Amino acid sequence: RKLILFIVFLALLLDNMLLTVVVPIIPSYLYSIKHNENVQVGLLFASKATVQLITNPFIGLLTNRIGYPIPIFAGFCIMFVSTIMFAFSSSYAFLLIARSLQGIGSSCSSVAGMGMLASVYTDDEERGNVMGIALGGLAMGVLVGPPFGSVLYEFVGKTAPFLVLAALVLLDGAIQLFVLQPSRVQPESQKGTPLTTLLKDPYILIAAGSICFANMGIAMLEPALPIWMMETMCSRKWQLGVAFLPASISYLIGTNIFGILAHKMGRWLCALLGMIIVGVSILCIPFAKNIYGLIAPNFGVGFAIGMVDSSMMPIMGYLVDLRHVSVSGSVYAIADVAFCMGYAIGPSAGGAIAKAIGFPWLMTIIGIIDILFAPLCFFLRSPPAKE
Numbered sequence: 453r454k455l456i457l458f459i460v461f462l463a464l465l466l467d468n469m470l471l472t473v474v475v476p477i478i479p480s481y482l483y484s485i486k487h488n489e490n491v492q493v494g495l496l497f498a499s500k501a502t503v504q505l506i507t508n509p510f511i512g513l514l515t516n517r518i519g520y521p522i523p524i525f526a527g528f529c530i531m532f533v534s535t536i537m538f539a540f541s542s543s544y545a546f547l548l549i550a551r552s553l554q555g556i557g558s559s560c561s562s563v564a565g566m567g568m569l570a571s572v573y574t575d576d577e578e579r580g581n582v583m584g585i586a587l588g589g590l591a592m593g594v595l596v597g598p599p600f601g602s603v604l605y606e607f608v609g610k611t612a613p614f615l616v617l618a619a620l621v622l623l624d625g626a627i628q629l630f631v632l633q634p635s636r637v638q639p640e641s642q643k644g645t646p647l648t649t650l651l652k653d654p655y656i657l658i659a660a661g662s663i664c665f666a667n668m669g670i671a672m673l674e675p676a677l678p679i680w681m682m683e684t685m686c687s688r689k690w691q692l693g694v695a696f697l698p699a700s701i702s703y704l705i706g707t708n709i710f711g712i713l714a715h716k717m718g719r720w721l722c723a724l725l726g727m728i729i730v731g732v733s734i735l736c737i738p739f740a741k742n743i744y745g746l747i748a749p750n751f752g753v754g755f756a757i758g759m760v761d762s763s764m765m766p767i768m769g770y771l772v773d774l775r776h777v778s779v780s781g782s783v784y785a786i787a788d789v790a791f792c793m794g795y796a797i798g799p800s801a802g803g804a805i806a807k808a809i810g811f812p813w814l815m816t817i818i819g820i821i822d823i824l825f826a827p828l829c830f831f832l833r834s835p836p837a838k839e
């Protein structure tokens with residue numbers, strides 16, 4: 453009963469460590485191998501997000517029809533396959549294929565783990581608060597990602613970070629012996645309202661846009677910042693990956709402090725501050741001309757993204773309880789689609805803008821748009837009811 457929480461937390465951890473061990477390796481590796489590369493790196497990064505966004509409805513169908521453990525085992529297999537593909541392949545196409553597979557793997561793991569965790573814990577009084585461990589699986593994975601993918605990549609080469617990640621994925625899959633079997637036909641029943649009907653509501657879009665933009669900021673920063681750092685003569689030792697470390701250590705505290713303080717000031721008055729602080733603190737990024745000049749803006753970016761996560765995650769459900777037939781899956785689907793839309797559109801537009809007009813202007817434009825988006829949170833003061 454307890455071990456499912458740890459298993460889903462670890463399966464999110466080993467997915468979102470994989471998601472961010474790529475950012476220091478593949479950009480620099482493709483920069484080196486060719487000695488305008490953004491036109492390819494951006495799409496190589498956006499493939500995972502577009503694949504997960506496409507795949508989510510079908511895995512939802514699979515979970516509704518024939519149960520949760522099957523997609524969990526599928527995701528467990530796909531994560532190891534993608535990791536072993538990263539550890540060995542060199543050509544661009546066979547990195548793109550693995551990043552494509554990682555999208556289906558992330559979809560399976562996230563959706564099925566959320567569903568089965570909700571099923572085991574059932575009622576709100578426990579499950580609703582326990583759900584916040586998803587963010588704790590997010591934060592530590594993102595924290596160990598860049599340092600582990602950079603330091604050992606400097607010390608013992610390309611294959612080491614993915615090799616040691618696979619050494620953990622195999623252990624996690626062996627611990628999953630208790631549930632998953634070669635042959636399992638499993639039951640499930642119908643609940644809730646589908647996303648395609650929920651997003652038809654224009655009011656929920658106002659809340660989804662905040663988290664979408666707050667993640668799109670970092671999703672555009674991710675493909676380009678290593679290239680920008682390489683252009684300004686940065687190294688790998690304590691330099692190439694550690695630049696992302698303050699953002700992670702700040703995210704750890706952002707998901708906790710204002711998560712505790714939410715109700716004390718109004719969650720919309722915290723979402724507004726998170727949005728504005730993201731917009732302001734990504735403007736300071738282009739103007740830093742030294743590695744130690746990037747510590748200050750990242751310590752704000754991570755904190756502000758955590759402040760938006762821990763102040764929008766309950767809200768997407770608080771409204772859905774007031775307007776539509778609600779279930780845990782319908783609550784999580786909004787957040788997952790809002791995450792994936794940003795993580796897909798960000799790199800796709802970045803790989804064009806940063807190459808046609810430049811990276812600092814891309815960050816400035818995103819910051820200004822994020823700042824100007826803030827007044828839209830005025831509407832969440834109180835939503836009116838409906839039939």
Ligand SMILES: NCCc1c[nH]c2ccc(O)cc12
Nearest residue numbers: 472594674696699700703754
């Ligand atoms: N896809 C960007 C991953 C990433 C790198 N550094 C980060 C810092 C905080 C965060 O939430 C996420 C990240």
